[PDB]
Amino acid sequence: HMELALNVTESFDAWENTVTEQAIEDVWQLFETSIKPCVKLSPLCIGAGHCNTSIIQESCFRYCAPPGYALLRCNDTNYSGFMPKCSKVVVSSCTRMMETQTSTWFGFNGTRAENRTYIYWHGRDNRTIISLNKYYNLTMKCRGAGWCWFGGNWKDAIKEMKQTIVKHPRYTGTNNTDKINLTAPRGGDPEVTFMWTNCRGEFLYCKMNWFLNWVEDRDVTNQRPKERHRRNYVPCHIRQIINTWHKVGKNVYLPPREGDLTCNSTVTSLIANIDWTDGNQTNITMSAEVAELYRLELGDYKLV
């Protein structure tokens, strides 16, 4: 039945991307797949040296969630990432997710969101992903019109996060000075900070810049530096037809609704893909989609 492995390939290309790209594309294949004619054809590659073309039988009411897909994890400690000696393994399947909530920025419910911030991270010397987790307060409710609300110490929190990310990258070599900024492009230049949010089915897009207007430095001053007064909401505009971030492309999905849905969600799990490759850059990024959801609970998604 299930006969996985534990191998991975990491390289240079993101358009010719593999695990990621494959995981993403296939997902909307499984997902777009819930509409009924009589008999459907599903694939089923995840790394076997050949492929499975899954075939659902039926006719020509309550159903779980993935007409054809399932997940499972290893086991042992709270979390790390990769280079395991992996052993015991568990059982799981359903995928109702579309129903519930989500975001490109901060994973929702966090659980024993201990005061002391976290940077829980799957490492790769240079090209890697993070998961920051602090107790402090953050809220994020959406109001359907296309504008999202908050509550918390978000300036300060980032500080912690920025206070956080300083302790583990220790003295590299030379006597140095820090200078954090963000982007997240690839091969081309945009110049905007988008985030998405799922909560109750509608797949809503947000133009998020005021939230993301901060240049970081080691030791600073703002006495003689400048001051203007700014406040915040979210100029979201649903894009059922999804305008794709990491690539100026397109996708869609077929949702439900409760007329006046006015989103809501608890913040905890702020994410990032920090870039620090040899030279002059500490490059925070915000791509970390649906497999992070389950990755959020287990340690690391395994699908098939």
Ligand X SMILES: *[C@@H]1O[C@H](CO)[C@@H](O[C@@H]2O[C@H](CO)[C@@H](O[C@@H]3O[C@H](CO[C@H]4O[C@H](CO)[C@@H](O)[C@H](O)[C@@H]4O)[C@@H](O)[C@H](O[C@H]4O[C@H](CO)[C@@H](O)[C@H](O)[C@@H]4O[C@H]4O[C@H](CO)[C@@H](O)[C@H](O)[C@@H]4O[C@H]4O[C@H](CO)[C@@H](O)[C@H](O)[C@@H]4O)[C@@H]3O)[C@H](O)[C@H]2NC(C)=O)[C@H](O)[C@H]1NC(C)=O
Ligand Y SMILES: *[C@@H]1O[C@H](CO[C@H]2O[C@@H](C)[C@@H](O)[C@@H](O)[C@@H]2O)[C@@H](O[C@@H]2O[C@H](CO)[C@@H](O[C@@H]3O[C@H](CO[C@H]4O[C@H](CO)[C@@H](O)[C@H](O)[C@@H]4O)[C@@H](O)[C@H](O[C@H]4O[C@H](CO)[C@@H](O)[C@H](O)[C@@H]4O)[C@@H]3O)[C@H](O)[C@H]2NC(C)=O)[C@H](O)[C@H]1NC(C)=O
Ligand Z SMILES: *[C@H]1O[C@H](CO)[C@@H](O[C@@H]2O[C@H](CO)[C@@H](O[C@@H]3O[C@H](CO[C@H]4O[C@H](CO)[C@@H](O)[C@H](O)[C@@H]4O)[C@@H](O)[C@H](O)[C@@H]3O)[C@H](O)[C@H]2NC(C)=O)[C@H](O)[C@H]1NC(C)=O
Ligand U SMILES: *[C@@H]1O[C@H](CO)[C@@H](O)[C@H](O)[C@H]1NC(C)=O
Ligand V SMILES: *[C@H]1O[C@H](CO[C@H]2O[C@@H](C)[C@@H](O)[C@@H](O)[C@@H]2O)[C@@H](O[C@@H]2O[C@H](CO)[C@@H](O[C@@H]3O[C@H](CO)[C@@H](O)[C@H](O)[C@@H]3O)[C@H](O)[C@H]2NC(C)=O)[C@H](O)[C@H]1NC(C)=O
Ligand W SMILES: *[C@H]1O[C@H](CO[C@H]2O[C@@H](C)[C@@H](O)[C@@H](O)[C@@H]2O)[C@@H](O[C@@H]2O[C@H](CO)[C@@H](O)[C@H](O)[C@H]2NC(C)=O)[C@H](O)[C@H]1NC(C)=O
Residue 46 has which token pair? 């995840």
Exposed e or buried b per residue across 255-287, where buried means at least 16 C-beta atoms within 10 angstroms of its C-beta: eeeeeebebbbbbbbbbbebbeeeeeeebbbbb
The item of ligand W, ligand Z, ligand U, none sharing an interface with residue 184, based on CB under 5 to 8 Å by kind, is ligand Z
By CB under 6 A, residue 44 contacts ligand U: yes
Closest residue by Cα to residue 130 from 165, 101, 97: 165
By CB under 6 A, residue 276 contacts ligand W: yes
Site for ligand W (CB under 6 A): which residue of 11, 53, 115, 223?
A: 115
Site for ligand V (CB under 6 A): which residue of 181, 240, 243, 262?
A: 181
Report the distance separating Cα 121 and Cα 133, nearest Å.
11
Q: Which of residues 69-88 bind ligand Y (CB under 6 A)?
A: 73, 75-76, 78
Site for ligand X (CB under 6 A): which residue of 121, 135, 147, 149?
A: 149
Q: Which stretch binds ligand X (CB under 6 A): 23-31, 33-41, 125-133, 144-152?
A: 144-152
By CB under 6 A, residue 184 contacts ligand Z: yes
Report the distance separating Cα 28 and Cα 228, nearest Å.
44
207, β-bridge pairs: 194
Do the bridges between strand 283-284 and strand 181-182 make them parallel or antiparallel, or are there none, so unpaired?
parallel
Do the bridges between strand 130-133 and strand 269-272 make them parallel or antiparallel, or are there none, so unpaired?
antiparallel
Closest residue by Cα to residue 128 from 294, 288, 304: 288
The item of ligand V, ligand Z, ligand X, none sharing an interface with residue 149, based on CB under 5 to 8 Å by kind, is ligand X
Pattern of binders to ligand Z over 249-278, x per CB under 6 A? --------------------------x---
Site for ligand X (CB under 6 A): which residue of 139, 181, 209, 244?
A: 139
By CB under 6 A, residue 141 contacts ligand X: yes
Site for ligand Z (CB under 6 A): which residue of 285, 286, 288, 291?
A: 285
139, β-bridge pairs: 151, 266
By CB under 6 A, residue 266 contacts ligand Y: yes
DSSP assignment letter at 266: B
Closest residue by Cα to residue 186 from 8, 13, 62, 3: 13
Report the distance separating Cα 20 and Cα 23, nearest Å.
5
Which CB, 39 or 55, lies closer to ligand U? 55
By CB under 6 A, residue 221 contacts ligand V: no
Q: Which of residues 186-205 bind ligand Z (CB under 6 A)?
A: 189
Q: How far is the CB of 143 from ligand Y (least distance, A)?
A: 14
Beta strand ranges found along 153-289 (DSSP E): 181-182, 194-199, 203-207, 269-272, 283-284
- Residue that has been written with the tokens 């945009």 in this structure: 190
By CB under 6 A, residue 109 contacts ligand Y: yes
Main-chain dihedrals φ then ψ at residue 154, nearest 5 degrees? -50, -35
- Amino acid identity of residue 53, one-letter, is T
Which CB, 19 or 241, lies closer to ligand U? 19
Q: Which stretch binds ligand X (CB under 6 A): 55-63, 147-155, 281-289, 290-298?
A: 147-155
Binding site for ligand Z (CB under 6 A): 181, 183-185, 189, 275, 280-281, 283, 285
Binding site for ligand Y (CB under 6 A): 73, 75-76, 78, 90, 100-101, 108-109, 264, 266, 298
Binding site for ligand W (CB under 6 A): 115-116, 125-126, 135, 276, 278
